[PDB]
Design a protein around this ligand. Structure first.
Ligand SMILES: [K+]
Ligand SMILES: [Mg+2]
Ligand SMILES: [Mg+2]
Ligand SMILES: [Mg+2]
Ligand SMILES: [Mg+2]
Ligand SMILES: [Mg+2]
Ligand SMILES: [Mg+2]
Ligand SMILES: [Mg+2]
Ligand SMILES: [Mg+2]
Ligand SMILES: [Mg+2]
Ligand SMILES: [Mg+2]
Ligand SMILES: [Mg+2]
Ligand SMILES: [Mg+2]
Ligand SMILES: [Mg+2]
Ligand SMILES: [Mg+2]
Ligand SMILES: [Mg+2]
Ligand SMILES: [Mg+2]
Ligand SMILES: [Mg+2]
Ligand SMILES: [Mg+2]
Ligand SMILES: [Mg+2]
Ligand SMILES: [Mg+2]
Ligand SMILES: [Mg+2]
Ligand SMILES: [Mg+2]
Ligand SMILES: [Mg+2]
Ligand SMILES: [Mg+2]
Ligand SMILES: [Mg+2]
Ligand SMILES: [Mg+2]
Ligand SMILES: [Mg+2]
Ligand SMILES: [Mg+2]
Ligand SMILES: [Mg+2]
Ligand SMILES: [Mg+2]
Ligand SMILES: [Mg+2]
Ligand SMILES: [Mg+2]
Ligand SMILES: [Mg+2]
Ligand SMILES: [Mg+2]
Ligand SMILES: [Mg+2]
Ligand SMILES: [Mg+2]
Ligand SMILES: [Mg+2]
Ligand SMILES: [Mg+2]
Ligand SMILES: [Mg+2]
Ligand SMILES: [Mg+2]
Ligand SMILES: [Mg+2]
Ligand SMILES: [Mg+2]
Ligand SMILES: [Mg+2]
Ligand SMILES: [Mg+2]
Ligand SMILES: [Mg+2]
Ligand SMILES: [Mg+2]
Ligand SMILES: [Mg+2]
Ligand SMILES: [Mg+2]
Ligand SMILES: [Mg+2]
Ligand SMILES: [Mg+2]
Ligand SMILES: [Mg+2]
Ligand SMILES: [Mg+2]
Ligand SMILES: [Mg+2]
Ligand SMILES: [Mg+2]
Ligand SMILES: [Mg+2]
Ligand SMILES: [Mg+2]
Ligand SMILES: [Mg+2]
Ligand SMILES: [Mg+2]
Ligand SMILES: [Mg+2]
Ligand SMILES: [Mg+2]
Ligand SMILES: [Mg+2]
Ligand SMILES: [Mg+2]
Ligand SMILES: [Mg+2]
Ligand SMILES: [Mg+2]
Ligand SMILES: [Mg+2]
Ligand SMILES: [Mg+2]
Ligand SMILES: [Mg+2]
Ligand SMILES: [Mg+2]
Ligand SMILES: [Mg+2]
Ligand SMILES: [Mg+2]
Ligand SMILES: [Mg+2]
Ligand SMILES: [Mg+2]
Ligand SMILES: [Mg+2]
Ligand SMILES: [Mg+2]
Ligand SMILES: [Mg+2]
Ligand SMILES: [Mg+2]
Ligand SMILES: [Mg+2]
Ligand SMILES: [Mg+2]
Ligand SMILES: [Mg+2]
Ligand SMILES: [Mg+2]
Ligand SMILES: [Mg+2]
Ligand SMILES: [Mg+2]
Ligand SMILES: [Mg+2]
Ligand SMILES: [Mg+2]
Ligand SMILES: [Mg+2]
Ligand SMILES: [Mg+2]
Ligand SMILES: [Mg+2]
Ligand SMILES: [Mg+2]
Ligand SMILES: [Mg+2]
Ligand SMILES: [Mg+2]
Ligand SMILES: [Mg+2]
Ligand SMILES: [Mg+2]
Ligand SMILES: [Mg+2]
Ligand SMILES: [Mg+2]
Ligand SMILES: [Mg+2]
Ligand SMILES: [Mg+2]
Ligand SMILES: [Mg+2]
Ligand SMILES: [Mg+2]
Ligand SMILES: [Mg+2]
Ligand SMILES: [Mg+2]
Ligand SMILES: [Mg+2]
Ligand SMILES: [Mg+2]
Ligand SMILES: [Mg+2]
Ligand SMILES: [Mg+2]
Ligand SMILES: [Mg+2]
Ligand SMILES: [Mg+2]
Ligand SMILES: [Mg+2]
Ligand SMILES: [Mg+2]
Ligand SMILES: [Mg+2]
Ligand SMILES: [Mg+2]
Ligand SMILES: [Mg+2]
Ligand SMILES: [Mg+2]
Ligand SMILES: [Mg+2]
Ligand SMILES: [Mg+2]
Ligand SMILES: [Mg+2]
Ligand SMILES: [Mg+2]
Ligand SMILES: [Mg+2]
Ligand SMILES: [Mg+2]
Ligand SMILES: [Mg+2]
Ligand SMILES: [Mg+2]
Ligand SMILES: [Mg+2]
Ligand SMILES: [Mg+2]
Ligand SMILES: [Mg+2]
Ligand SMILES: [Mg+2]
Ligand SMILES: [Mg+2]
Ligand SMILES: [Mg+2]
Ligand SMILES: [Mg+2]
Ligand SMILES: [Mg+2]
Ligand SMILES: [Mg+2]
Ligand SMILES: [Mg+2]
Ligand SMILES: [Mg+2]
Ligand SMILES: [Mg+2]
Ligand SMILES: [Mg+2]
Ligand SMILES: [Mg+2]
Ligand SMILES: [Mg+2]
Ligand SMILES: [Mg+2]
Ligand SMILES: [Mg+2]
Ligand SMILES: [Mg+2]
Ligand SMILES: [Mg+2]
Ligand SMILES: [Mg+2]
Ligand SMILES: [Mg+2]
Ligand SMILES: [Mg+2]
Ligand SMILES: [Mg+2]
Ligand SMILES: [Mg+2]
Ligand SMILES: [Mg+2]
Ligand SMILES: [Mg+2]
Ligand SMILES: [Mg+2]
Ligand SMILES: [Mg+2]
Ligand SMILES: [Mg+2]
Ligand SMILES: [Mg+2]
Ligand SMILES: [Mg+2]
Ligand SMILES: [Mg+2]
Ligand SMILES: [Mg+2]
Ligand SMILES: [Mg+2]
Ligand SMILES: [Mg+2]
Ligand SMILES: [Mg+2]
Ligand SMILES: [Mg+2]
Ligand SMILES: [Mg+2]
Ligand SMILES: [Mg+2]
Ligand SMILES: [Mg+2]
Ligand SMILES: [Mg+2]
Ligand SMILES: [Mg+2]
Ligand SMILES: [Mg+2]
Ligand SMILES: [Mg+2]
Ligand SMILES: [Mg+2]
Ligand SMILES: [Mg+2]
Ligand SMILES: [Mg+2]
Ligand SMILES: [Mg+2]
Ligand SMILES: [Mg+2]
Ligand SMILES: [Mg+2]
Ligand SMILES: [Mg+2]
Ligand SMILES: [Mg+2]
Ligand SMILES: [Mg+2]
Ligand SMILES: [Mg+2]
Ligand SMILES: [Mg+2]
Ligand SMILES: [Mg+2]
Ligand SMILES: [Mg+2]
Ligand SMILES: [Mg+2]
Ligand SMILES: [Mg+2]
Ligand SMILES: [Mg+2]
Ligand SMILES: [Mg+2]
Ligand SMILES: [Mg+2]
Ligand SMILES: [Mg+2]
Ligand SMILES: [Mg+2]
Ligand SMILES: [Mg+2]
Ligand SMILES: [Mg+2]
Ligand SMILES: [Mg+2]
Ligand SMILES: [Mg+2]
Ligand SMILES: [Mg+2]
Ligand SMILES: [Mg+2]
Ligand SMILES: [Mg+2]
Ligand SMILES: [Mg+2]
Ligand SMILES: [Mg+2]
Ligand SMILES: [Mg+2]
Ligand SMILES: [Mg+2]
Ligand SMILES: [Mg+2]
Ligand SMILES: [Mg+2]
Ligand SMILES: [Mg+2]
Ligand SMILES: [Mg+2]
Ligand SMILES: [Mg+2]
Ligand SMILES: [Mg+2]
Ligand SMILES: [Mg+2]
Ligand SMILES: [Mg+2]
Ligand SMILES: [Mg+2]
Ligand SMILES: [Mg+2]
Ligand SMILES: [Mg+2]
Ligand SMILES: [Mg+2]
Ligand SMILES: [Mg+2]
Ligand SMILES: [Zn+2]
Lengths: 122, 59, 118, 16, 204, 131
RNA sequence: CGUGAGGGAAAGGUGAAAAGAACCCCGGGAGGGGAGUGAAAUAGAGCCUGAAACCGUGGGCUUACAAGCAGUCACGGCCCC
RNA sequence: GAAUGCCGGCAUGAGUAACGAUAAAGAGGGUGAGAAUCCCUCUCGCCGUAAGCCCAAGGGUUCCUACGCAAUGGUCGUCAG
RNA sequence: CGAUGUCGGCUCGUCGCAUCCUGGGGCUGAAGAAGGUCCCAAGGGUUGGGCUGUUCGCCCAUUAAAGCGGCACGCGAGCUGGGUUCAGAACGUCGUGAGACAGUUCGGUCUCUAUCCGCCACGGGCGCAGGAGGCUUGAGGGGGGCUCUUCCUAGUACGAGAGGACCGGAAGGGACGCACCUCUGGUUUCCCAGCUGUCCCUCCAGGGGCAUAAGCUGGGUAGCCAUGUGCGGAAGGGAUAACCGCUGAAAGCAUCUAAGCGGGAAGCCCGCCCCAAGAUGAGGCCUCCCACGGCAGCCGGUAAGGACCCGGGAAGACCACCCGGUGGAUGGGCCGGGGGUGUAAGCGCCGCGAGGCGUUGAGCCGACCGGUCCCAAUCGUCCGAGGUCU
């Protein structure tokens, strides 16, 4: 449950540390994004000399949410933060790594590259 | 609010037509099988102190 | 809405409703019969019946439980010694409520007696 | 949408 | 156009192909037909259905006459299924098979005098910034001198629920003839122990 | 009619009795069936059970672990056919039925706060001696 | 009423005569019903006359598919003389 | 017949809003024509840098006791400034 | 002018169509895709944020689109009170001055009670020619009506290439609506536990009050809920709009038309869900009651039946509605299960002690699913047809 104003940790080596969502890309007026949704966000904080800097307007896919997400098998899964991975307009990651686990929902939604890059898929 | 207030005095006819539902209904009473006195059903007879065919309470 | 909720509020806040049930039970386990309003009467049935049942068990735990509501060591003793035993074979229903025929003058409240069963 | 602002014609009412 | 009377019993979820399916259990059979309506006699086609046994003491005389003409034991409720003619004298769950797609009518939960926010999902008033004893009020209900009245139909507070609601196109997950049990996928109007009607869906 | 009974009846065909009992505070390994591309596999989840909601057949339990620097919680229905087995890896001792509070503790504090429930350990070893 | 200067009301009538109703009855009392006084008691003291607004009981006519400055003109029904 | 006229009487709104701190009550016993409301007992709750106690102002018999309940008391009253 | 409250916002909408999108078209300087332009169409839809009192506008990010207007520039007896009409104070400017300025600045009292119409809900009455208990028909109303992406067809038709379809067929979404509580997530005023200060019971142990109208803290059933779940928009049938025809005169040709017949919209009528015979035009079916007495009428007692009274209820402001009233499981108690809490008191052992271990998943235990006549629904009373005329 990510919406405009929501901060996210970035889970990659692009150089951003925190991005703040300003728009969820899922139709004309989707209220929330979840795992596997592409958001548009501003970069609020970054490390020196990254591929990205504070102030940019970038796109990212949400990989972990703190509101638990439900699955067809009757289970659920939930992470301790809300994080995302920055992308280009081809749904490909922009960094060369991703940190921490990511949700298996990403695979189903076609963010294949990210899933293999992830240390664990839960 | 702006202090609503009646626009016209109510006609005798219309005040009394509002009261068309104000009549009391007579109390509902049954004889007591012991002392034959009229009493509310499901209550202890306040005349002779009987309810359910036994003396319950000192009248 | 109030769907499937159990137990009246009796226009008393939480701790006052509580003292009410206690003081009623105190009065009831003392005189064996009292008069109250009908709603008050119906609510007392359960509250006392539970205490009486605990006297029937007789153990130490039971006494200390009961003593939380009733508070009076003498009265508890009476409940345990005199009251309880005359219910050893009675399985629930240790009290009865019967409705009185005349309302109160000052407020028209329907009255009823509540008493301990023979 | 009337382009010229229209004056109030009654004061904000006071206890007077 | 087949139908049956039943009772709502409660919800759970079962497992079917590594999937959890929310379901509602309804006790449907058996329902004896106790009158049939024909175009000659009544103008249309239906089957009057009966459901749940009744203490014959509690069934008055005009009603006793009605059952006896059917060859039928006294029953708690009568309801019709329209445009329906089962060949038997009794209808059971056997008329629906898993996979079939049904409609169910129930009597909705009653919320009594409901406010405008619960009933019609109005937005209420703001909760600070000066909002003044209007936090759950409806706001304007009109215009001014034109039209100078309130439309019929205008959404306002009033009773809500305790009314006939039909939910349509539910998947039949299972049927257990040995218990007169019907497992429909999804949520059914009304409280547990409530009366319902289950028909073949009017959806394609 | 007995409405509760009817429910449990419908439910009964899915009820499992084969899984081990466990308490909140215990550390557990849940072998869960998972699908990906294109196959299905067994993926283990190992953590502390921090909560056990009870509703008969609808009882569900919640397990928490730290994976590569991030806290993860998993919720499982206890009679899910998708669970292969659950292995008790350690008995722990809570004084509390729901353990939400460990979400804010360090790995050190948790170890102090949830000591090994030595009683249920001997108890687990008392069995595990077959005939 | 106003600190004060000062402001500033309402409120008349039993009967010729109290002969102002002993006494009994219901009622805690109030009040009443009888008895009694009187030419008269809807002259009974909450008292000459006792208008109108206003409230009530009883009786005739009338009214629950009807659109109204409330009346008027016509006709018919019912009730009274 | 009108002067938002004057004095008085009586309506309408209406059996409606309200009955003045959300510190809180319950039972038993007594008294009496009548009792949730007076007295008595027991239980519960509230104030305690007061919601206790003593002075000054101001009020002027409100003090104590007996006998009362038309009115005053926001209900009731057998109680009472 | 013995008062018609005034900008903007919020709230709630409803209407117009000169249509922003979605549907149907003609022309194109229409290859395809995508546009331009006019015609038809008001069914539905038409986002979030920065600035400013703003409406407007500009900008950011999206979108199928981010339409324009009317309703006292809709809506202050519905809210706001930032704008602007009072009294204070200051700046620039004008005036000798008092003061003033479509010049600016800071501050500045927005009225518990709805009589009538109207609206949303709910009853009482009478009627619907015999009186009744059920089950219904649907005149007529209301609700609803949105739309995107990707894939296959097919990298095909088209095009030098870049690009890229009609038609048809699958899958997944957004917002909205109705219902629901199995899961997920809330609340859960006393269902459990821990904790402090103080007063108390009864000294220890064990408890009780108060610290809020829960003292605080960790939890939490049923219910009521959304953030959670199911489902809906249609399909289809008919009639049309613009537009395209077939056959075809007047008018030897031509013409969609003058006679006749086709195709054709998210729109219209039906279909779907809800209300509905006060539909006084008061409908229909099934079943029960009976032609009782005294004087289209009155009176008395009854019939079928109903009400009163009572125990209640996911029904509910009262009312109504539904269930039950000893021939009974309606509530309360009690027993069992679930469920919460998470190992009671007491005793034994270990430690100087705070404590720790065992007995013990113990003790306690609202509402949930059930059982059981232990307690209470005693006993009863009153209404209630004798059927108008051709
Ligand atoms: K001015
Ligand atoms: Mg910067
Ligand atoms: Mg106002
Ligand atoms: Mg008002
Ligand atoms: Mg106000
Ligand atoms: Mg007012
Ligand atoms: Mg007025
Ligand atoms: Mg009058
Ligand atoms: Mg009158
Ligand atoms: Mg009126
Ligand atoms: Mg309700
Ligand atoms: Mg409430
Ligand atoms: Mg109940
Ligand atoms: Mg309680
Ligand atoms: Mg209740
Ligand atoms: Mg009250
Ligand atoms: Mg009280
Ligand atoms: Mg409370
Ligand atoms: Mg308290
Ligand atoms: Mg208290
Ligand atoms: Mg009784
Ligand atoms: Mg009194
Ligand atoms: Mg009574
Ligand atoms: Mg139904
Ligand atoms: Mg509201
Ligand atoms: Mg709603
Ligand atoms: Mg809502
Ligand atoms: Mg809002
Ligand atoms: Mg606001
Ligand atoms: Mg709000
Ligand atoms: Mg204010
Ligand atoms: Mg105010
Ligand atoms: Mg407020
Ligand atoms: Mg206005
Ligand atoms: Mg207005
Ligand atoms: Mg008009
Ligand atoms: Mg209702
Ligand atoms: Mg199956
Ligand atoms: Mg239910
Ligand atoms: Mg259940
Ligand atoms: Mg069974
Ligand atoms: Mg793995
Ligand atoms: Mg003066
Ligand atoms: Mg003076
Ligand atoms: Mg003067
Ligand atoms: Mg004078
Ligand atoms: Mg004289
Ligand atoms: Mg004289
Ligand atoms: Mg006398
Ligand atoms: Mg006397
Ligand atoms: Mg006298
Ligand atoms: Mg008298
Ligand atoms: Mg006299
Ligand atoms: Mg004489
Ligand atoms: Mg003479
Ligand atoms: Mg006279
Ligand atoms: Mg005279
Ligand atoms: Mg006089
Ligand atoms: Mg004279
Ligand atoms: Mg006179
Ligand atoms: Mg007079
Ligand atoms: Mg007169
Ligand atoms: Mg009269
Ligand atoms: Mg008509
Ligand atoms: Mg008529
Ligand atoms: Mg006219
Ligand atoms: Mg004429
Ligand atoms: Mg005449
Ligand atoms: Mg004149
Ligand atoms: Mg005046
Ligand atoms: Mg006047
Ligand atoms: Mg006037
Ligand atoms: Mg005057
Ligand atoms: Mg005059
Ligand atoms: Mg005057
Ligand atoms: Mg006057
Ligand atoms: Mg009056
Ligand atoms: Mg009233
Ligand atoms: Mg009123
Ligand atoms: Mg009121
Ligand atoms: Mg007052
Ligand atoms: Mg009131
Ligand atoms: Mg008071
Ligand atoms: Mg008070
Ligand atoms: Mg308070
Ligand atoms: Mg007393
Ligand atoms: Mg007494
Ligand atoms: Mg009293
Ligand atoms: Mg009295
Ligand atoms: Mg006293
Ligand atoms: Mg002190
Ligand atoms: Mg002095
Ligand atoms: Mg004085
Ligand atoms: Mg004096
Ligand atoms: Mg003295
Ligand atoms: Mg004195
Ligand atoms: Mg004194
Ligand atoms: Mg005295
Ligand atoms: Mg007095
Ligand atoms: Mg008196
Ligand atoms: Mg006196
Ligand atoms: Mg007084
Ligand atoms: Mg008084
Ligand atoms: Mg007073
Ligand atoms: Mg008095
Ligand atoms: Mg006295
Ligand atoms: Mg006094
Ligand atoms: Mg004016
Ligand atoms: Mg005026
Ligand atoms: Mg005027
Ligand atoms: Mg005025
Ligand atoms: Mg005015
Ligand atoms: Mg047009
Ligand atoms: Mg188009
Ligand atoms: Mg094209
Ligand atoms: Mg081209
Ligand atoms: Mg075009
Ligand atoms: Mg055209
Ligand atoms: Mg439209
Ligand atoms: Mg419209
Ligand atoms: Mg529009
Ligand atoms: Mg802002
Ligand atoms: Mg803004
Ligand atoms: Mg703006
Ligand atoms: Mg601002
Ligand atoms: Mg501007
Ligand atoms: Mg476009
Ligand atoms: Mg915009
Ligand atoms: Mg508009
Ligand atoms: Mg306008
Ligand atoms: Mg305006
Ligand atoms: Mg306005
Ligand atoms: Mg205002
Ligand atoms: Mg305004
Ligand atoms: Mg106004
Ligand atoms: Mg107005
Ligand atoms: Mg409002
Ligand atoms: Mg202002
Ligand atoms: Mg400005
Ligand atoms: Mg100003
Ligand atoms: Mg000023
Ligand atoms: Mg200045
Ligand atoms: Mg200057
Ligand atoms: Mg100058
Ligand atoms: Mg100068
Ligand atoms: Mg000037
Ligand atoms: Mg100037
Ligand atoms: Mg000016
Ligand atoms: Mg200037
Ligand atoms: Mg300035
Ligand atoms: Mg300002
Ligand atoms: Mg200020
Ligand atoms: Mg205000
Ligand atoms: Mg009022
Ligand atoms: Mg009114
Ligand atoms: Mg009017
Ligand atoms: Mg009616
Ligand atoms: Mg009625
Ligand atoms: Mg027909
Ligand atoms: Mg109509
Ligand atoms: Mg229709
Ligand atoms: Mg329609
Ligand atoms: Mg291709
Ligand atoms: Mg779809
Ligand atoms: Mg549940
Ligand atoms: Mg839940
Ligand atoms: Mg759950
Ligand atoms: Mg939960
Ligand atoms: Mg407790
Ligand atoms: Mg407590
Ligand atoms: Mg303590
Ligand atoms: Mg101690
Ligand atoms: Mg204390
Ligand atoms: Mg205290
Ligand atoms: Mg307190
Ligand atoms: Mg919680
Ligand atoms: Mg809590
Ligand atoms: Mg719960
Ligand atoms: Mg939701
Ligand atoms: Mg169609
Ligand atoms: Mg057609
Ligand atoms: Mg041609
Ligand atoms: Mg031709
Ligand atoms: Mg020619
Ligand atoms: Mg033609
Ligand atoms: Mg055609
Ligand atoms: Mg045509
Ligand atoms: Mg064609
Ligand atoms: Mg459509
Ligand atoms: Mg219907
Ligand atoms: Mg009818
Ligand atoms: Mg009907
Ligand atoms: Mg008509
Ligand atoms: Mg009929
Ligand atoms: Mg009730
Ligand atoms: Mg009944
Ligand atoms: Mg009976
Ligand atoms: Mg019986
Ligand atoms: Mg029972
Ligand atoms: Mg029970
Ligand atoms: Mg259990
Ligand atoms: Mg358990
Ligand atoms: Mg232990
Ligand atoms: Mg122990
Ligand atoms: Mg020792
Ligand atoms: Mg249990
Ligand atoms: Mg219990
Ligand atoms: Mg039995
Ligand atoms: Mg009797
Ligand atoms: Zn008697």
């Amino acid at each position: 449950m990510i919406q405009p104003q929501t901060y996210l940790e970035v889970a990659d080596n692009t150089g951003a540390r925190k991005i703040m969502c300003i728009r969820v890309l899922k139709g004309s007026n989707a209220k929330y994004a979840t795992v596997g949704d592409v958001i548009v966000a501003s970069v609020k904080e970054a490390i020196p000399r990254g591929a990205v800097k504070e102030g940019d307007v970038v796109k990212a896919v949400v990989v972990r949410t703190k509101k638990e997400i439900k699955r067809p098998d009757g289970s659920a899964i939930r992470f301790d933060d809300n994080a995302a991975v920055i992308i280009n307009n081809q749904l490909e990651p922009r960094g060369t790594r991703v940190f921490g686990p990511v949700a298996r929902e990403l695979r189903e939604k076609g963010f294949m590259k990210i899933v293999s890059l992830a240390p664990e898929v839960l | 609010a702006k202090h609503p207030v009646p626009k016209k005095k109510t006609s005798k006819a219309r005040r009394d037509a509002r009261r068309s539902h104000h009549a009391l209904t007579p109390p509902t009473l049954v004889p007591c099988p012991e002392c034959k006195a009229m009493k509310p059903p499901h209550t202890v007879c306040p005349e002779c102190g009987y309810y359910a065919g036994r003396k319950v309470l000192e009248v | 809405m109030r769907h499937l909720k159990s137990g009246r509020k009796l226009n008393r806040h939480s701790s006052h409703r509580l003292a009410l049930y206690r003081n009623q039970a105190k009065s009831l386990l003392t005189h064996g019969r009292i008069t109250t309003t009908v709603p008050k009467a119906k609510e007392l049935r359960g509250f006392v019946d539970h205490l009486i049942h605990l006297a029937k068990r007789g153990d130490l735990h039971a006494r200390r439980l009961v003593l939380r509501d009733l508070q009076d060591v003498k009265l508890v003793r009476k409940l345990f010694d005199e009251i309880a035993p005359r219910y050893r074979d009675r399985q629930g229903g240790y009290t009865r409520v019967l409705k009185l025929a005349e309302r109160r003058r000052g407020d028209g409240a329907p009255l009823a007696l509540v008493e301990l069963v023979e | 949408r009337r382009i010229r602002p229209r004056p109030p014609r009654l004061p904000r009412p006071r206890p007077r | 156009m087949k139908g049956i009377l039943g009772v709502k019993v409660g919800m759970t979820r079962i497992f079917r192909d590594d999937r959890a399916v929310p379901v509602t259990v309804i006790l449907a059979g058996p329902c004896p037909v106790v009158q049939r309506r024909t175009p000659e006699k009544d103008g249309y086609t239906a089957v009057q259905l009966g459901f749940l046994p009744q203490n014959p003491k509690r069934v008055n005389r005009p009603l006793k006459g009605h059952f006896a003409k059917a060859g039928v034991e006294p029953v708690r409720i009568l309801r019709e299924i329209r445009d329906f003619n089962p060949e038997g004298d009794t209808v059971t769950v056997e008329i629906f098979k898993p996979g079939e797609r049904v409609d169910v009518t129930g009597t909705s939960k009653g919320r009594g005098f409901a406010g405008v926010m619960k009933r019609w999902n109005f937005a209420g008033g703001p909760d600070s910034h000066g909002a003044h004893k209007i936090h759950r009020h409806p706001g304007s209900i009109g215009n001014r001198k034109t039209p100078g009245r309130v439309y019929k139909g205008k959404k306002m507070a009033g009773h809500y629920g305790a009314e006939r609601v039909t939910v349509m196109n539910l998947e039949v997950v299972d049927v257990i003839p040995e218990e007169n049990l019907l497992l429909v996928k999804g949520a059914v109007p009304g409280p547990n122990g409530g009366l319902v009607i289950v028909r073949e869906t009017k959806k394609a | 009619m007995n409405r509760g009974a009817l429910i449990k009846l419908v439910e009964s065909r899915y009820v499992r009795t084969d899984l081990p009992e466990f308490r909140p505070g215990d550390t557990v390994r849940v072998s869960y069936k998972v699908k990906e591309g294109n196959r299905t596999r067994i993926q283990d989840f190992e953590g502390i059970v921090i909560r056990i909601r009870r509703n008969g057949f609808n009882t569900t339990f919640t397990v928490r672990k730290v994976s590569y620097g991030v806290g993860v919680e998993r919720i499982f229905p206890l009679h899910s056919p998708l669970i292969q087995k659950i292995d008790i890896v350690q008995r722990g001792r809570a004084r509390r039925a729901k353990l939400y509070f460990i979400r804010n503790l360090s790995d050190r504090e948790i170890r102090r706060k949830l000591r090994a429930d030595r009683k249920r350990i001997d108890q687990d070893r008392a069995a595990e001696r077959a005939a």
